[PDB]
Design a protein around this ligand. Structure first.
Ligand SMILES: [Cl-]
Length: 248
């Protein structure tokens, strides 16, 4: 493949300097979705219900009628005020009446109906196992349940959000698996072409191995590269390194 080795070498070193510490700070302090999850977890006081709601919610988080951060806050406030029991019934009222996710409701409710027989029986012990030692397994099982490709964008997003939910519920950071490849993203794809003609999944897999940053955490870092005020206020002097990534 045609590669700009010098630019790739700089990219790797900048990502090494940011590291998992920066990715985690972006996920928890820059991404307002994380605080939305903290609010819901505190208000429900039922970590099994909280985590299952996050997975189901992520599986319907496509073609939104608003910004992602607004949607996750609407979800958090709605289920804090109207805590659910029957998840299909709850979403049947929530989605068409929401501001930020009222499009394609029929297909979204079918997806909730499809996932609930898998999520409902899970115990907190099994959920802990998925979080601490099984996020790749969860991705594969969700894809099977949903009759979706293993790399399907919304399946992978559900695992990403599950990682946030577990970090909150279990008070421990577990990095995303190296095996979950870089998400398929129009902005990432255009950025990759600055460095190589190689397909991004292969390229970012090597970058992940060379930096020790799993691809889903690289994706977190690339979000502000590709909000900026919130980053400068939380990553400290490492915020300039984010600006270095955009200008590569
Ligand atoms: Cl999907």
């Amino acid at each position: 493949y045609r590669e700009d080795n010098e630019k790739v070498n700089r990219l790797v070193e900048i990502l090494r300097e940011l590291g998992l510490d920066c990715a985690r700070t972006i996920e928890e302090k820059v991404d307002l979705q994380f605080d939305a999850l903290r609010n819901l977890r505190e208000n429900l006081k039922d970590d099994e219900l909280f985590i299952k709601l996050v997975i189901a919610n992520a599986l319907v988080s496509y073609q939104l009628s608003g910004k992602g951060e607004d949607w996750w806050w609407e979800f958090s406030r709605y289920f804090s005020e109207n805590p659910p029991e029957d998840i299909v019934e709850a979403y049947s009222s929530f989605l068409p009446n929401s501001k930020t996710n009222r499009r394609l409701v029929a297909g979204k409710l079918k997806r909730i109906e499809r996932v609930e027989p898998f999520l409902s029986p899970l115990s907190i012990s099994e959920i802990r196992d998925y979080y601490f030692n099984g996020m790749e397994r969860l991705r594969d099982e969700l894809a099977r349940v949903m009759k979706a490709k293993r790399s399907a964008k919304t399946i992978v997003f559900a695992v990403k959000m599950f990682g946030y939910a577990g970090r909150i519920a279990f008070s421990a950071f577990v990095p995303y698996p190296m095996a979950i490849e870089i998400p398929d993203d129009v902005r990432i794809n255009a950025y990759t072409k600055r460095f190589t003609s190689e397909p991004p999944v292969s390229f970012w897999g090597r970058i992940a191995e060379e930096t020790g940053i799993p691809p889903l955490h690289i994706d977190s870092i690339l979000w502000p590269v590709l909000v900026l005020r919130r980053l400068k206020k939380h990553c400290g002097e490492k915020a300039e390194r984010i600006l270095e990534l955009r200008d590569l």
